[PDB]
Write an enzyme that holds these catalytic residues in place. Structure first.
Site, PDB file in Angstrom:
ATOM      1  N   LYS B   4      47.440  50.737  40.364  1.00  0.00           N
ATOM      2  CA  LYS B   4      47.675  51.099  38.974  1.00  0.00           C
ATOM      3  C   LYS B   4      47.347  52.563  38.723  1.00  0.00           C
ATOM      4  CE  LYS B   4      44.991  49.562  35.597  1.00  0.00           C
ATOM      5  NZ  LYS B   4      44.722  50.716  34.706  1.00  0.00           N
ATOM      6  N   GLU B  30      35.751  51.590  28.825  1.00  0.00           N
ATOM      7  CA  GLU B  30      35.834  51.607  30.277  1.00  0.00           C
ATOM      8  C   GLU B  30      34.472  51.348  30.900  1.00  0.00           C
ATOM      9  OE1 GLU B  30      39.039  52.924  32.798  1.00  0.00           O
ATOM     10  OE2 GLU B  30      38.574  51.046  31.761  1.00  0.00           O
ATOM     11  N   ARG B  31      34.469  50.651  32.032  1.00  0.00           N
ATOM     12  CA  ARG B  31      33.287  50.636  32.877  1.00  0.00           C
ATOM     13  C   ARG B  31      33.010  52.049  33.359  1.00  0.00           C
ATOM     14  NH1 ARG B  31      36.618  46.386  34.423  1.00  0.00           N
ATOM     15  NH2 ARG B  31      35.712  44.319  34.056  1.00  0.00           N
TER      16      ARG B  31
END
Ligand SMILES: [Mg+2]
Lengths: 54, 161, 271, 156, 126, 151
Positions: B4, B30-31
Site C-alpha cells: 500500500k 496513525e500508530r
C-alpha cells in the site's frame, strides 16, 4: 569368506557391552555419593536457617 | 503486506512528474511506529528529501495517542495545506487520508465528550454533516483541484455500517 | 435475534462444509472411477461386438420380458436414480401396453425403493451393498447367478444404466439382452461354427454376466461424477444462504447496539 | 572419574534377541544417569561459619553443629559390582577367542577350496571324471539309478 | 526465519484442508501427506508449562519436524520424540547449538550436521 | 434431578469429620420451597440437630421475596459467619453460595434503584464496590481457609 570376516569384526566389537555396564556402575556410585553429600548439606542448612529465622 | 505505501509513494511521484502538483499525507489516528516507518520509507524513495528543496509531499500527523479533538482536526489541517496548493498555486494536488475511519471515530469521541446524544450504532448525531463539511472541500475549481485518496477501514467487515 | 441468527448461520456453515468434504470425496472416487472404466469399457464392448456384428434383432412376437435397472444404494447423486426410475417406468408402460408380461430387477437400494411402491407385482429380485465399493466381476457373477436361478425364463430383456459421457454429462442408456432361442433361431447365426444349444447357452449366460458387469462399471463412474457436481451445487447454495444470513446478522447487530445505547442514555438523562 | 566412551549402534549390534529389552533399559539408565550427574555439581557448597557466628545467638549450636559436621564422614559406598562383570567379560573374551580361532580355521579352509577351484583344466581337455571331481554334484547317482542312463529320462 | 517460513506455509496448507479429515483415506495422496504433516506440526507445537525453550533448541526441533523426518512417525509419539531427541541434542551436541546461537542462522555446515544428528537419532529412536 | 443436596451435605459432613471445620450455607435470593426442602433434608440427615449442639452447618437465607438490598447483602452475611470460623478457630470452612447469578442480578436491581450506573454495566467481579471485595475475602489466609462452593 567375507561374511565370516564380517562375523570376525562383529564379535571383536563385543567388548562394548561390558564397559557400558561399568559406566553405569561408576556413574550410579558417584550419584548416590553426591546425593548423600547434598542430603547432609541441605539438612544442616535447614536447621541453621530455621534457628536464624525464628 | 500488499504494497500500500509503495502505491502511495508511486502516486505521489507520478502526480508530481506528470501533472506538476504536490501531495499531502494526513495521518489521522496513525500508530506512531507506522508513522515513523512511513516517514523513513518516504525519505529513502526520494519522495521526501531532507537535504534540498525538491521534496514532493508535506506530512501532517495526528497520532493514535492524542485527545480526540486533535485526531478529528488533523484531517482539516492536511486539507488546508492542500487547499493552499490548489488555490494559490493552481495545481492538481493529492491528499492522502490514512485513516478515514479514525477520523469518523475521533468525531464520535469529540461528540460524546461534549455530551451530545449518540445517533444510531454509536456515531455522533452530526456524522454525515461532519463528513460533508470535510469532503466538500476536496474538489475541482477554476484554479486547480484536489484529488483525495482515503484508506477505508470497514468496521466488522460491514459495509452497511 | 443475534443469538438465533448465529445459531442458524452455524447450522448452515456445518452442512456447507459437510457438502464440501463429500464433494471432494466424490471427486476422489471419480478418480479410479474413470480409470477402471477404460479396460472395463473395452471388455464390455468386446463382449457385445458379436451381437453387433451378427446383427441379431430379437423377437418382436413374444411377451415374457426382463427389465434390469442399475443404480446404487447411496443418495445425493442428483438425477441418477430419478433418471433410471423414469426410463424404467416409461418402458414398463410401453411394453405392458403390448400386453408383454414384464418383470423387474433392481441393482441398488435406491431404484428398488423408488420403483417398489408403484411397481411391486412386476418384480422378481433386487440387490443391495452396491455403491460403497467399486464394483468387480464377482458382483456381476453373483447377479447373473441369481437371475438365472429364478424360475423365470425371460425371452427378451434389457438393462438400463447411466452411460458415463463426461464429468458433467451422462446419458441414461438401455442395452438389449437376448435369450438362447433368439440367438439360436437367428438365421444370421447360421454362419457361426461348432454351434449347438449347449454352447450357445453357456455363451449366453456368460454374456449376461459380462453386460451386467459393464453396466455396473459405467453406472458407478456416472454416479460418482453426478454426486461431485451435485455436492458442488449444494455448497454454492449454502454459501449464498450464508451471505444472506451475514447481511441479516449485521443488521441485527447494528440494531442491538443502537437499542442498548438508547437504554443507557435514557436511563442517564432522567436525572 | 573414569568413564569409557562408547558407540551405541555398535552396542545394538551385539545384543542377542533374547535380552534386548533389559539391555535397552540398561541403555536408558545410562542416559538418565548421565543427566543426574549433570543435575548437580561435584561438591556441595560448605556452610560458612562467620555468617552464623555473628547471627545465631544460640549458645554453641552453630559451633557444635559445624564441629559434628566436620566430625561427620559420609559413607562413600563401595561397588562390589565391578569384579563380577570383569570376570564375566573375561569368560566372554575366552569364548569369543576360541570362536574366532575356529572360524579362522574355517576361513583358511574355504580359501584353500576356492584356490583349488581356481586352478582348473581348460574345459576342452577335461574328462567327465575331472569334471565330476571339480563338481561332485555333476556325478551320477550310481545307486538310485544303477542302470543307464543312471538318471531320470525327464531331466535327460 | 529459515525454518518458520516453510513451517507457516505448510501449516496454512494444512488448515485450508483440515476440514477434510476423518475421510482422508478417500482423498488424493499428496493432500493426504499435507494433512499428515500438518498434524505432525501441530503436535510439534504443543508445549508444557513453565518450560521456555531456548531459541536454538526451538529451531532444531522445528527443523526436525519440517523436513519430513516425522512423516513416518505416528502422531501419538511425536511429543515423546520431541522430548528425548531434544535431550540428546543438548547432551552430546552442545557445540552445534553454541555455534547456531553465535550466528543465528542454519549454515550449510550446521545444516549438514543437523541432517546427521536427526537421522542418527531417528534411527536410534523407538 | 441428580442428587446434589446429598453431595453438599456429604461435603459438609466429611469436612466436619476429617477436619475440625464447619460450614456456612448462604441461600442468596433463592426459592423458599427449595430452601425449606434443604433445611429439612439436612435436619433428617444428621447435619443439623435441633436438640443438641453438634450441628455441622450454619444457615443464612435470603428469599426471593425480599428487597434487592437484602438479596445483595445476604451473601456477605454468610461470608462473615464463615470468616469468624476461619480467622478465630483456624478451621477450613466450607461456604456454599446457592447462586452467584442471584447475587449479581439482585445487585443489578440495587444499582438500578439508585439510578447511578446504567443497567448495561451489570456487575463486575473485579470492582471493589461490587462482587470484587466479596470474592476476595474467600481465600487461604495463613490462619485458615474459606472455600466457596457455588451451585
Ligand atoms: Mg452460579
Amino acid at each position: 569368506i567375507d561374511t565370516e570376516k564380517s562375523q570376525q569384526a562383529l564379535v571383536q566389537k563385543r567388548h562394548y557391552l561390558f564397559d557400558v555396564q561399568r559406566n553405569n556402575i561408576a556413574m550410579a556410585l558417584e550419584v548416590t555419593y553426591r546425593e548423600r553429600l547434598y542430603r547432609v548439606y541441605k539438612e544442616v542448612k535447614n536447621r541453621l536457617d530455621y534457628h536464624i529465622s525464628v | 503486506g500488499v504494497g500500500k505505501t509503495v502505491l502511495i509513494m508511486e502516486l505521489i511521484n507520478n502526480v508530481a512528474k506528470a501533472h506538476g502538483g504536490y501531495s499531502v499525507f494526513a495521518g489521522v489516528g496513525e500508530r506512531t511506529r507506522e508513522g515513523n516507518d512511513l516517514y523513513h520509507e518516504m525519505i529513502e524513495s526520494g519522495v521526501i528529501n531532507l537535504k534540498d528543496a525538491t521534496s514532493k509531499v508535506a506530512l501532517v500527523y495526528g497520532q493514535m495517542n492524542e485527545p480526540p479533538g486533535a485526531r478529528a482536526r488533523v484531517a482539516l489541517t492536511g486539507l488546508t495545506v492542500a487547499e493552499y496548493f490548489r488555490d494559490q498555486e493552481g495545481q492538481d494536488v493529492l491528499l492522502f487520508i490514512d485513516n478515514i475511519f479514525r477520523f469518523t471515530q475521533a468525531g464520535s469521541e469529540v461528540s460524546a465528550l461534549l455530551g451530545r446524544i449518540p445517533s444510531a450504532v454509536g456515531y455522533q448525531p452530526t456524522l454525515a454533516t461532519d463528513m460533508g463539511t470535510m469532503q466538500e472541500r476536496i474538489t475541482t475549481t477554476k484554479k486547480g483541484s484536489i484529488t483525495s485518496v482515503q484508506a477505508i477501514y470497514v468496521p466488522a467487515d460491514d459495509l452497511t455500517d | 435475534t443475534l443469538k438465533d441468527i448465529t445459531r442458524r448461520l452455524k447450522s448452515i456453515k456445518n452442512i456447507q462444509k459437510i457438502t464440501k468434504s463429500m464433494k471432494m470425496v466424490a471427486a476422489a472416487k471419480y478418480a479410479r472411477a474413470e480409470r477402471e472404466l477404460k479396460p472395463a469399457r473395452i471388455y464390455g464392448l468386446g463382449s457385445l461386438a458379436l451381437y453387433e456384428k451378427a446383427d441379431i434383432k430379437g423377437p418382436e412376437d413374444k411377451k415374457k420380458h426382463l427389465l434390469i435397472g442399475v443404480s446404487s444404494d447411496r443418495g445425493l447423486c442428483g438425477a441418477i436414480h430419478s433418471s433410471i426410475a423414469k426410463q424404467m417406468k416409461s418402458e414398463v408402460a410401453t411394453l405392458t401396453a403390448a400386453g408383454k408380461e414384464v418383470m423387474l430387477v433392481g441393482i441398488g437400494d435406491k431404484i428398488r425403493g423408488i420403483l417398489y411402491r408403484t411397481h411391486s407385482d412386476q418384480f422378481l429380485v433386487a440387490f443391495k451393498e452396491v455403491g460403497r465399493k467399486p464394483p468387480t466381476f464377482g458382483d456381476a457373477s453373483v447377479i447373473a447367478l441369481e437371475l438365472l436361478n429364478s424360475g423365470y425364463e425371460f425371452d427378451e430383456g434389457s438393462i438400463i444404466f447411466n452411460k458415463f459421457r463426461s464429468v458433467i454429462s451422462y446419458k441414461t442408456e438401455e442395452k438389449p439382452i437376448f435369450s438362447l432361442n433368439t440367438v439360436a433361431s437367428a438365421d444370421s447365426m447360421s454362419i457361426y461354427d461348432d454351434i449347438d444349444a449347449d454352447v450357445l447357452q453357456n455363451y449366453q449366460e456368460y454374456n449376461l454376466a459380462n453386460i451386467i458387469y459393464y453396466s455396473l462399471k459405467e453406472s458407478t463412474t456416472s454416479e460418482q461424477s453426478a454426486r461431485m457436481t451435485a455436492m458442488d451445487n449444494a455448497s454454492k447454495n449454502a454459501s449464498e444462504m450464508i451471505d444472506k444470513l451475514t447481511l441479516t446478522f449485521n443488521r441485527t447487530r447494528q440494531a442491538v447496539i443502537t437499542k442498548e445505547l438508547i437504554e443507557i442514555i435514557s436511563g442517564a438523562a432522567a436525572l | 572419574l573414569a568413564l569409557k566412551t562408547i558407540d551405541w549402534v555398535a552396542f545394538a549390534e551385539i545384543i542377542p534377541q533374547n535380552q534386548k529389552a533389559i539391555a535397552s533399559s540398561l541403555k536408558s539408565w545410562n542416559e538418565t544417569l548421565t543427566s543426574r550427574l549433570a543435575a548437580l555439581p561435584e561438591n556441595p557448597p560448605a556452610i560458612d561459619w562467620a555468617y552464623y557466628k555473628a547471627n545465631v545467638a544460640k549458645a554453641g549450636l552453630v559451633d557444635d553443629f559445624e564441629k559434628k559436621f566436620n566430625a561427620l564422614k559420609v559413607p562413600v559406598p563401595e561397588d562390589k559390582y565391578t569384579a563380577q562383570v570383569d570376570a564375566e567379560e573375561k569368560e566372554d573374551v575366552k569364548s569369543c577367542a576360541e570362536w574366532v580361532s575356529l572360524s579362522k580355521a574355517r576361513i583358511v579352509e574355504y580359501e584353500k577350496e576356492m584356490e583349488k577351484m581356481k586352478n582348473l583344466i581348460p574345459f576342452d581337455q577335461m574328462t567327465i571324471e575331472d569334471l565330476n571331481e571339480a563338481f561332485p554334484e555333476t556325478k551320477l547317482d550310481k545307486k538310485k539309478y544303477p542302470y543307464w542312463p543312471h538318471q531320470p529320462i525327464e531331466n535327460l | 526465519k529459515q525454518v518458520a517460513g516453510t513451517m507457516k506455509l505448510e501449516l496454512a496448507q494444512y488448515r485450508e484442508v483440515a476440514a477434510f479429515a476423518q475421510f482422508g483415506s478417500d482423498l488424493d495422496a499428496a493432500t493426504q501427506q499435507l494433512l499428515s504433516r500438518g498434524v505432525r506440526l501441530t503436535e510439534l507445537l504443543k508445549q508444557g508449562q513453565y518450560s521456555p525453550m531456548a531459541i536454538e533448541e526451538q529451531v532444531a526441533v522445528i527443523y526436525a519436524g519440517v523436513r519430513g523426518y516425522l512423516d513416518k512417525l505416528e502422531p501419538s509419539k511425536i511429543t515423546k520424540f520431541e522430548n528425548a531427541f531434544l535431550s540428546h541434542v543438548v547432551s552430546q551436541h552442545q557445540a552445534l547449538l553454541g555455534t547456531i546461537r553465535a550466528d543465528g542462522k542454519i549454515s550449510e555446515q550446521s545444516d549438514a550436521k543437523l541432517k546427521e544428528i536427526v537421522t542418527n537419532f531417528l534411527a536410534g529412536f523407538e
